[PDB]
Amino acid sequence: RERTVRLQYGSRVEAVYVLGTYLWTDVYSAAPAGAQTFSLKHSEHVWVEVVRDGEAEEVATNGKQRWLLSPSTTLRVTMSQASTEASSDKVTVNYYDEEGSIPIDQAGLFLTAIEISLDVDADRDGVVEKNNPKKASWTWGPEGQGAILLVNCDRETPWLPKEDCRAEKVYSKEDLKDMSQMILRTKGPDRLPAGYEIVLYISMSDSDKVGVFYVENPFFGQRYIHILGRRKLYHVVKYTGGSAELLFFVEGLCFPDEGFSGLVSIHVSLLEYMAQDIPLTPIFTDTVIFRIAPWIMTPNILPPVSVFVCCMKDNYLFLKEVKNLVEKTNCELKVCFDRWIQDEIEFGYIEAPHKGFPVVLDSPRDGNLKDFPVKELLGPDFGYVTREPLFESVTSLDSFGNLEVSPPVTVNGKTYPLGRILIGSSFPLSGGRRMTKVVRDFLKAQQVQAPVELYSDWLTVGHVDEFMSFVPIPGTKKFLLLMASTSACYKLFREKQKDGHGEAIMFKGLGGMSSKRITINKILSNESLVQENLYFQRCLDWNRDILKKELGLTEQDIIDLPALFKMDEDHRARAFFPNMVNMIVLDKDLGIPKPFGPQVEEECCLEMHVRGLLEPLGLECTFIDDISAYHKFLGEVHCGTNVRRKPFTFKWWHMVPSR
Amino acid sequence: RERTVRLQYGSRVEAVYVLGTYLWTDVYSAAPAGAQTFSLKHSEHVWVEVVRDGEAEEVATNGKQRWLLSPSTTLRVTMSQASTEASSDKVTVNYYDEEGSIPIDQAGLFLTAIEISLDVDADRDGVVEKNNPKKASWTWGPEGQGAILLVNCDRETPWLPKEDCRAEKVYSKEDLKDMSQMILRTKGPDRLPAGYEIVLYISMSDSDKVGVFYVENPFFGQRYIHILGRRKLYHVVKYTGGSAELLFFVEGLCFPDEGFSGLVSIHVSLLEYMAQDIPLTPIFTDTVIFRIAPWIMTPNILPPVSVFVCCMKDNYLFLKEVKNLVEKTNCELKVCFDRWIQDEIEFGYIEAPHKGFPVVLDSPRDGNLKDFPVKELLGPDFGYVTREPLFESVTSLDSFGNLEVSPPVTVNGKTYPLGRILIGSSFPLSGGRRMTKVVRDFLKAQQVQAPVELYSDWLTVGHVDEFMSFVPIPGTKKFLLLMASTSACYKLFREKQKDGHGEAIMFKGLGGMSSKRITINKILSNESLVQENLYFQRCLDWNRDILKKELGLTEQDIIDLPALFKMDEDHRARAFFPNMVNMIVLDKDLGIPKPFGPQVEEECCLEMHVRGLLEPLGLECTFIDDISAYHKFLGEVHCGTNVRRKPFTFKWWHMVPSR
Ligand SMILES: [Ca+2]
Ligand SMILES: [Ca+2]
Ligand SMILES: [Ca+2]
Ligand SMILES: [Ca+2]
Ligand SMILES: [Ca+2]
Ligand SMILES: [Ca+2]
Ligand SMILES: [Ca+2]
Ligand SMILES: [Ca+2]
């Protein structure tokens, strides 16, 4: 950086020189009238070049050498080390008229060199390197750089109930591990020259995105001074001489969102005082950039950690069968004593090079079924985030049964290493339901999961989790998409009827269904029901095509599971028997809703068919009965499970998202 | 594109096949119970493959060949040409049980193949190519593609006073040349099969960004039907058989801005009717993208076309000297009978491959000096755009004396082929004036001029045009930055004093200045005035450094012109004599404000000094006296000029802007 510092007519100018810059110095404007030539002297630690029309020549500390005064002949002044002061650092210029060799005047420059660098971990190893030249920008990819910041959305202690980022005060030390370090490094003499001060600052816009603290170590214990953030745009820094470092901790307050890219800036400036009523001049400015880490979801293929379950305390079969399934795995089971864990919560995570933790997204309140957020999962290294609409009404499509994510896929050459978020919607011209804009905008803004809308609005409840899921193929790195299929169910029932099983009864053991006496015959002879399910198969097939296109899937990647629906008064589908596709996936072990299908030789023909599809792949199937405690099935699921998974090993900052 | 079309149990399914796709067909779900094998027949124009577990085999129009029924054995159905109908296009599947060779059932697929393509000029040559595969995205650069749209911001006829884009009706044909062509091309039989329709549509969000018209040629003359736009989100298209083209014209209503990237989408879908109360299914969708052309400014280096001048009718010297200067060039002079042409107007332009026109940006009204926009320049191929603040007060920094643009520059390897917009501001921590956000946001959103803020708030008026300008170097492709310099003025005056000229009088011939009797001596002996101008030189030097950094300039690229200011009660600068830097640049010819400096041998020493700087470069200087009609100079300029220039030859869409 070239900085302009010109000599002043018959005067000695004092300036602070910041290392990493250099000065160009006009000696011509300061020459007395009549002056012809000049000479110069300079101290040991100052490098001085005489530059005439672009060509430079170094000059000795004291030469008697004289040059022609001229506007195009200037000085270039460089220093490579900070002033000890001690430290006479100066350049002095003498002026001579035509006749006689004694100087007729003098102008001088007295310099104090200091180092000022605001440093962050831009190279993303968890340590703050000295003056990364790339610290002022942020680039994606394995070769990309720039510092990363977590939203500090967890809670260190229950005493103050809100997320840590909702306070301008730090009430606990462990909080510091969630933040990103920023160090102001300076080197110089005992004091700054008269008229200077160093100031940290942020823009008004960024002031609600971040907060910045300094940890003071005064007499009575460590304390955290909040120096930038909400309603603090600048902080005057106390200068310390010699080599000094000031450590700051930065917290994010906000996830990327509509109107906020995720990028924020912090600045330090050396300011020079001019006079009263005149603003201070920013002599030098150094900038660092942070990108706030996005909220990221976990597909079913990722290793399970915890299985969260909610049910009534008397659903014994459900609890026993889930407990047993989990015991086949290394997962922990957590139970709460009714679908809220599935519908109201999506477990995601955030990560930065220095740390990461899981973060819950909380579905919006409708003012009917949900009047209150679920914050009870908020805790140490378990974060919380939510979005609520302003004018928009919430519908069933805002439930997180309607929010899922694919395994990593490659589509037309483009890799999506974190998978793609999937949410259900209605056709553009339909006037149907859609997830609220506020939530859709939030998911889109995270960018690294590139969301895709599917068609869920043909279902009464309207959730993608009703019709599709993903499972790993054991012993490989591959996965399958599972799709509900009504055509598969009809084909199976028709075969069983042909086989002499037409009188086989659905719903065995649900006493509340017995008087209906539903048989394969009864189902197959219902003409309107056939027509309803042909239509529902068209709806499923429309989704199949979107999934194949947007996930880069072929028919080889898909298995169809038998399903059946009944149309409601809105021309929307509700499950006729439990939807087996919505299943608990713990690696090779699958908890599958028990269908209560027609019994043939005392086994459910739906269970046997599903085992015949999945078991050859090495998938182990356990059928879980959540409904027999209720004595009947109306199309509604009363129990819920949500699996918290390990994050992807692929770092999100190694992705390169579309512009 | 693979599309799912499955056979229906014991039924003949009718489907429209859109060319460019192909179908995968399940024959297994439609097989009767007990069926073992199947055979198939197909017509001439249908290609059918039997696919077992991913391996495909083509099958003859009628073979007697039988395959094992199985879920993993399916059909793949392809058509390469549209149905004439005429046209029996079908695939028929026969089912057989174990014992006996006569078919026990049949399922069939009756197909009507059509071509549907929505086409735009994506390759940017001005003609609409057939089905550019890149038409659904927009990329920058010489190899980039996607279609470009102009904001139709001019006015075809004065009858309806507003810009054309502010009406949902087309009142003149010439308007069509401003728009972009979009053609829906279809090929098929005489009619679509029962239950289908073709619909064009746009999103609600995009509905205020565009409008789309069809030109009907009915009995009484051509007319323009507005089929998409404000409060029209969709249009049902009338299908024509054979090969048909429907021509549409698209207009932009909005420039890129805060919250609007400039990109918009138009869709066509083939919809299938299901039943009453059930939304129509989008069987096929084709999408085109338009990017709306940005508003672009012109630096002083570009060829001049028209010089616009405003003054009082009695300023004779000004008019005579401007007229004469322009006569040295090929420019036209336009005069209006007071700085509004300079302050209230910035001439820009827009361009698309099919056409471009100049466009005026109109400075915001303050409710004091400007209560009304200047729309009188609005006309055929002269466009208009404006931005007004909502809650923000307008200040002097919103005048377009404060809005300029650099010549093309390269900075740290990055080329800015259109130059960089320059606007004056105040320091971040100063609490000073700044251009309104609404205007700043607009300029930033155009993206191709990557704006830079300079420091203008040390000036009373506060405009970058007060202290800096650019001139070409004649006979070369290079340019210089000119900077006001107070140090240069003092050096010159000190030399003249030494030379015996101290009693030389400023402002000769302005009788309203005579009693002040201002001389070189009087100026040089004023101590406080020296201090004021030393400070003003620091302000100029701060800008010099920003310009060098952000424009990639060295000292070799800069010439300093003498200037002098007087500090006001706000500690801000007003010109002591006319600022010579704010000059009319017509290629090698420069109209320079006449300074009225001290006379030495009956020539102004400021004029002679400026000629000595510029003339060796081949620049011709004409000094223009706008003030003698007023008899005095108070620091205010009463006349204004604005030069309308030819656009850059470099196409804006060939740039690659930062992410
Ligand atoms: Ca590091
Ligand atoms: Ca915390
Ligand atoms: Ca923590
Ligand atoms: Ca979910
Ligand atoms: Ca073309
Ligand atoms: Ca027009
Ligand atoms: Ca026009
Ligand atoms: Ca201007």
Curated annotation (Swiss-Prot), chains A, B:
Class of the enzyme per the UniProt entry, highest EC level: hydrolase
Residues where Ca(2+) 1 binds: 121, 123, 125, 127, 129
Outcome (variant: residue 175 to A): Reduced enzyme activity
Substitution effect: residue 164 to A: Reduced enzyme activity
Binding, Ca(2+) 5: 346, 400, 403-404
Binding site for Ca(2+) 2: 152, 154, 156, 164, 175, 178
Active site: 639 (nucleophile)
Binding site for Ca(2+) 3: 154, 156, 178, 381
Entry note: cofactor: Binding of Ca(2+) triggers a conformation change that is essential for catalytic activity.
Pfam (any one): PAD_M
InterPro entries in UniProt: Cupredoxin, PAD, PAD_C, PAD_central_sf, PAD_N, PAD_N_sf, Prot_Arg_deaminase_cen_dom
Record text on subunit structure and interactions: Homodimer.
Protein name, per record: Protein-arginine deiminase type-2
Organism per entry: Homo sapiens (Human)
Gene name, Swiss-Prot/TrEMBL: PADI2
